Amino acid sequence: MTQQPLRGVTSLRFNQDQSCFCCAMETGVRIYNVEPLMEKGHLDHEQVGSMGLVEMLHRSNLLALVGGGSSPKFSEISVLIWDDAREGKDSKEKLVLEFTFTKPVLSVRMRHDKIVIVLKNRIYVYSFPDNPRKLFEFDTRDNPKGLCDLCPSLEKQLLVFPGHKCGSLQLVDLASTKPGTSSAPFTINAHQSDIACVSLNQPGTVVASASQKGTLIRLFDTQSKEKLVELRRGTDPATLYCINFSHDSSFLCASSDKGTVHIFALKDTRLNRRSALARVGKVGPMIGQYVDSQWSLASFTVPAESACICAFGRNTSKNVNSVIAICVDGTFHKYVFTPDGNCNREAFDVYLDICDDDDF
């Protein structure tokens, strides 16, 4: 049963610096600034039809578009590049490039010099925007969610996706890889079940991942491959929708099908809650892994039936950090949190009911 898209939202994505988000819909595409929450432009159904995927390149005029939903003008096997800064009387003049494949596109990732196209069992990497050429192609395990993350750093060209072994990650340095050569992806055995979420931090020094069990989030150093931390979202299984780092890598947020967004401290791990059993010192040989688990510093609730992406906002002050949740039901949630674990709603809006203020 494909859940009918709540309010017609088919996909949600933050841009690379989490400062904008894009919304693919049954009625086209919408682009929002996160702080302040404001519509920055849309593509209507008359321009693009129903859309399955949108990815924005940073804060530029370049969008990668994949047709999908109930009434698409474009194929689910084509990635179209829209250039919104092009003057043209016809919407077709803003379509600057097309990448066509033999299977449906499940995710697109962009950075300043590259576009990455994810199919169910293959990942393609091209140079972008100028004179696009295929640089690399990678085989994957069954990747039906298009799971891939691409480091946005100028200094590191790290790609991460699900590896061939169940619950493994493959990491590829695209700068160290000669074009047309297989630089061997290095493998991290992150989980025992299939990967559900993966994210890199901004410098590409740390990878976070969660499996389909969604009880644990594991962080690894991307160079040494060592497990840095194991975070516990909950006791109970949960489908994670999103995991993201803060810009400074001090925190990690995680959204799930429990209607909860969890916040973890990564830099000062003492801010994370620990099980009370960890204070009842080492009584017996079998409780060791539950005692060392770090629980969320803070958490807040969102509508439980609404899938949501989560990210960090801009630091408003020296000790107050913000987390945004964008939900497929059209709701925007902003929470402020502090190192003592207080977490309070700062803003709530219905981002789909934000019209362009054609009044000023």
Added chain:
Amino acid sequence: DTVVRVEHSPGDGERGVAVEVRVQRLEYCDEAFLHKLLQLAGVRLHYEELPAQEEPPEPPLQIGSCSGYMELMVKLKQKLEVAGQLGSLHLLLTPRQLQQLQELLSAVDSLLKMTLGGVTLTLLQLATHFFTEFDATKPCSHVRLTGTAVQLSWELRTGRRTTSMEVHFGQLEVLECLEYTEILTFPGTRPCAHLRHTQILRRVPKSACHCHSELALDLANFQADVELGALDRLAALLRLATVPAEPEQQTVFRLSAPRATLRLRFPIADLRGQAVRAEQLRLELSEPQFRSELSSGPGPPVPTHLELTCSDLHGIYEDPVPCLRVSKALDPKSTGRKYFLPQVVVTVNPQSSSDPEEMRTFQSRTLALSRCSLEVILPSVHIFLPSKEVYESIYNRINNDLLMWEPADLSTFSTLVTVLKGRITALVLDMEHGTLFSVSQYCGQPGLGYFCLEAEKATLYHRAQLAPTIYPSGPHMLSTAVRIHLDPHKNVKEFLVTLRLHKATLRHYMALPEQSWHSQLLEFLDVLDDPVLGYLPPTVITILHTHLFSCSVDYRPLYLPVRVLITAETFTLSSNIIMDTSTFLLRFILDDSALYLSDKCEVETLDLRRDYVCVLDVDLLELVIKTWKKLSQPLFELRCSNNVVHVHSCADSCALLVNLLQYVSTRVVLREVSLVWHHVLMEIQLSKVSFQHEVYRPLSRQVFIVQELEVRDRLASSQINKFLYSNMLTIKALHVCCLRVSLMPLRLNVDQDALFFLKDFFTSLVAGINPVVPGREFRFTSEVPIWLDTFAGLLIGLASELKLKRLCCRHGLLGVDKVLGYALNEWLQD
């Protein structure tokens, strides 16, 4: 003493009559010219001897008492001529068979006679008693042969009695049943009424009673037949005895005269106000004519003819006043000295008997089948009285009262006309070698016929004054060979008009408005007014298949045209659909038209070739319009799906053409705009410019939608080199205010001859076209990464190199501010 010494004696008592020479009620006072003065009065043909064994119960009414003194009793036995006081008796019994057989048997010498007063015979087939009383002097059913002053010379050459009789007087034959509805002949003086050879009834002449009666009456005077109710009431009383009510002889009936006053009225009889046909028709004081040829037996196995001839007969027809007043035929034709004359022929065949080449043979076959007829051969009649109206009177009489005259005889008939010169008086008759046709019930089935028309005319002659004098230029003109296959059960008017105006010029718009055209459409326009009996007016419906082949149009008048020449080849208005309706499919399949322009816009224009240079020719234009007044619900969907428009020109030629045009609701064309070879040669193409104006974009979308706008060439170069303004170059895709561009890989490649050569072309244009006035948000993008190679000067110097303007919602243009919007900011590349 009144010695009565005579009675019935031995004689050949006929079947129908008793041979009994009785001198009754007469004092027979008898007191080699041996004269016994007597009184033979009372000879009676009581007759009826055959029926009912002499019909003794009812003796016949026809009987004569005191039927002439005949006292003189001239001459005796020997040319036994007798000068008498008794004219003759009348056998009122059937004068076709019984009386004829009695006379033949009695006759079985060259005796003459000279009677006195011409008894009023009343042979019907006590009136015969009146005939006997008139012999003593000598409404209907009043057949009377009474020469008042009988000059009868009974030649009676019995040597098979080849008899004869020449008289100097005539009868008065109201021939009627056994409203003045019968003939009223009044011939009377010898030439005035030259009655000749009335009866033969002898086996010598023919071998009824074998008459062969050549009653070739040759009179030469008035002899007025004042009234004649019908021709048919004449065939019945001659073939049958008679079947009217209150309401092996070969009769050769010849009649020639210079003058014999006459009336002709049609036959409209109940059996087969007045008669509808030809109201008040008189062949007044024409030639005598009306010469017939009949037979005693009904349903004549041999055909029946009825001829006529007249030089310039002044026959006032349908009189107000005649529609044609004189035969006026001075038309010598043969190598020898000939003078053509008119004729009205008739050829009746027994009932139930047995396009130069198409129209002729079809109606020849229709003439071989006769249940009625009519025929005319008018060489140059063309006549009309000074009081006449071809537009109105001819319509009102000779088209309504034409076929509804009880057409049947023993309704498959025919009709022909033939004129070497015609005049449609009141107006461009132009008539030479023309005809008119008509048929009824072709092959026996009602609804099938062959209506036709032919001529050869000069095209357009105007009226009040002076003629237009068009057609200064082996099918014939106005070959309107229409076809009709209407159905009596449907009871609706169907037309299959295969019109053909060959090499004509059918324009009548004389003045600046269609004035003489208005006159033509007020005179000619009348759709077969048919109030006659048996035809309640069927609802009119027209299905044309016209062919205006080679109808050149070069004299279309306006305020100030310049000897405009448009040489069409075929104008095939083959409207297979009904025109008189909301929808009308009209396949204008033209074949290779052209156009030629004269010298100078001011009306007077002369040049070496008036068939001047070509300006705008068309290879083919299949404007298949379906006007709904392609399933396009919008009214008047003029889907002119034109094929292509070639155009060739020089700067002077197109400048002059533009001056000519200046001085003188879906529309989805999808029509190629120009394969323009346009002294200079510079090819330009515009393929599939689907300018569907007002197609939708809500109001007059008018999308240029130019599928290809490649400006093939300019300057002096005629070879194609890609200049610009599949491609879908909707340069003028509009709304209500928009524009676009096709982003072609290379648009402006200007390195050929002089890019300003089109600028000097525009200079020569403003020199030719003396008046040159134009010297939501638009988003009027140029939308092409221009691969280029004074703006023209810089393009020439540089000959990618430029960029597309992308004027999103600029609105820099205002119809005159397009240059202003183009001048916004600045741009340069490479």
